[PDB]
Amino acid sequence: MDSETLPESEKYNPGPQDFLLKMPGVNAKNCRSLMHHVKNIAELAALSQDELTSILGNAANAKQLYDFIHTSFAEVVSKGKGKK
C-alpha cells in the first residue's frame, strides 16, 4: 500500500539513508518514498531534474534537491553577488 508502507525501515541502511534524510527538498514523507524508489543517494545525484520530480511529485522539492546538489557552495562563497 502506497509505495509500500511496511515497518521494514528498521533494516534500511542507516548510513546512506541519513544523507537522504537530510536532503534539502526531501522531507520525511518524500524521503521514504525516495529510499523506496531510488537505489541510493548517488542515483538521485546522477539522475535528471525530471526523474526526482516524478518521484517527489513536487517539482519544487525536486528542483531544490537537484539544484542544491549540482551547485557549488564554495563557488558561491568565492564569487557572484560580491565577495571579499
Partner: protein, 84 residues
C-alpha cells in the same frame, strides 16, 4: 523555496553539506570544511571516491571509506536486485 534568497542559500547549503559529510561517525566538522574547500559542491562530494576523499588535504582513507559507503550504499540494502 531554495532560491528564496541567495545570501541565505549559501548559508543553508554549507550547513546542510556539513551534516551530510558528518553522516558518518568518523567524519567530523573538521573534515566537513576540508571537503568543502576540496570539492566545493555536493555533486562532487557524492561523486568522490575513497581515493578522492583520501587525497584531500588532511583526511585519511578511514573516513573516506565510511563516506564512500554512505555515498554508494543502497537505502534498503537489497530491494530485490539493484545490487546484491
Amino acid at each position: 523555496m531554495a532560491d528564496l534568497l541567495m545570501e541565505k542559500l549559501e548559508q543553508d547549503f554549507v550547513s546542510r553539506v556539513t551534516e551530510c559529510l558528518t553522516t558518518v561517525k568518523s567524519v567530523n566538522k573538521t573534515d566537513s570544511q576540508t571537503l568543502l574547500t576540496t570539492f566545493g559542491s555536493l555533486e562532487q562530494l557524492i561523486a568522490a571516491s575513497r581515493e578522492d576523499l583520501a587525497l584531500c588535504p588532511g583526511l585519511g582513507p578511514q573516513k573516506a571509506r565510511r563516506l564512500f559507503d554512505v555515498l554508494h550504499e543502497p537505502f534498503l540494502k537489497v530491494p530485490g536486485g539493484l545490487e546484491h
